[PDB]
């Protein structure tokens, strides 16, 4: 293949959207503080959220590293910042469920999901993919517990 918008144009939009809103790397000490490093690649994402009730009030992502990691976290935490715990647990319940079923999203909203899965498989990109993946699922947990 010469040109394919499979991942290139996808993360292109992911980082460009992140540039239209130039905010990244922050720390909110309140309720949940979960950071995830990739000491091989240099990525470091400190996910500091504030869930004040049964929702998500805010989230600060101190994400450093490469193009995908700091961007994906910012994108998924933006959706989380505007969600609840039920909706977050559901999003991750289906997020993991996709891997058992085949390929499907209840909302069809696979913008980051298809980007994160793209790098998920390359030996060098898998640890940056699992980085954002495991860090987000670890923040508020997933499904109804995960464990
Ligand atoms: Zn990295």
Curated annotation (Swiss-Prot):
Zn(2+) binds at residues 41, 43, 66, 128. It is an enzyme of class 2 (transferase). Its cofactor is Zn(2+). GO terms for biological process: intracellular iron ion homeostasis; iron-sulfur cluster assembly. Pfam families: NifU_N. InterPro entries: NIF_FeS_clus_asmbl_NifU_N. It comes from the Bacteria. The keyword Calcium does not apply. Its EC number is 2.-.-.-. The keyword Coiled coil does not apply. Transmembrane segments: none annotated. One of its GO terms (molecular function) is ferrous iron binding. Bind 1 Zn(2+) per monomer. One of its GO terms (cellular component) is cytoplasm. Keywords: Metal-binding, Transferase, Zinc. Signal peptide: none annotated. SUPFAM superfamilies: SufE/NifU. Disruption phenotype: Essential, it cannot be deleted. Upon depletion cells grow very slowly while aconitase and succinate dehydrogenase, both of which contain Fe-S clusters, have decreased activity. Upon depletion no change in reactive oxygen species is observed, while a modified bacillibactin (BB), an endogenous siderophore, is produced. Interacts with SufS; this interaction enhances SufS cysteine desulfurase activity. Interacts with frataxin/Fra. NCBIfam families: SUF_scaf_2. Part of the SUF-like system that mediates the biosynthesis of iron-sulfur (Fe-S) clusters. Acts as a sulfurtransferase and thus transfers sulfur from SufS to SufB. Mechanistically, the transfer from SufS to SufU is triggered by zinc-ligand swapping that provides a free thiol from SufU to accept sulfur from SufS. Belongs to the NifU family. This is Zinc-dependent sulfurtransferase SufU. It comes from Bacillus subtilis (strain 168).
């Amino acid at each position: 293949m010469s040109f394919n918008a499979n991942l290139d144009t996808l993360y292109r939009q992911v980082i460009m959207d992140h540039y239209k809103n130039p905010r990244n790397k922050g720390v909110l000490n309140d309720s949940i503080v979960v950071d995830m490093n990739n000491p091989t690649c240099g990525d470091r994402i400190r996910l500091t959220m504030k869930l004040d009730g049964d929702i998500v009030e805010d989230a600060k992502f101190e994400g450093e590293g490469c193009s995908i990691s700091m961007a994906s976290a910012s994108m998924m935490t933006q959706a989380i910042k505007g969600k609840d715990i039920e909706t977050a647990l559901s999003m991750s319940k289906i997020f993991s469920d996709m891997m058992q079923g085949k390929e499907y999203d209840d909302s069809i909203d696979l913008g980051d999901i298809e980007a994160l899965q793209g790098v998920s498989k390359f030996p060098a990109r898998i640890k940056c993919a699992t980085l954002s993946w495991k860090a987000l699922e670890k923040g508020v947990a997933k499904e109804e517990g995960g464990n």
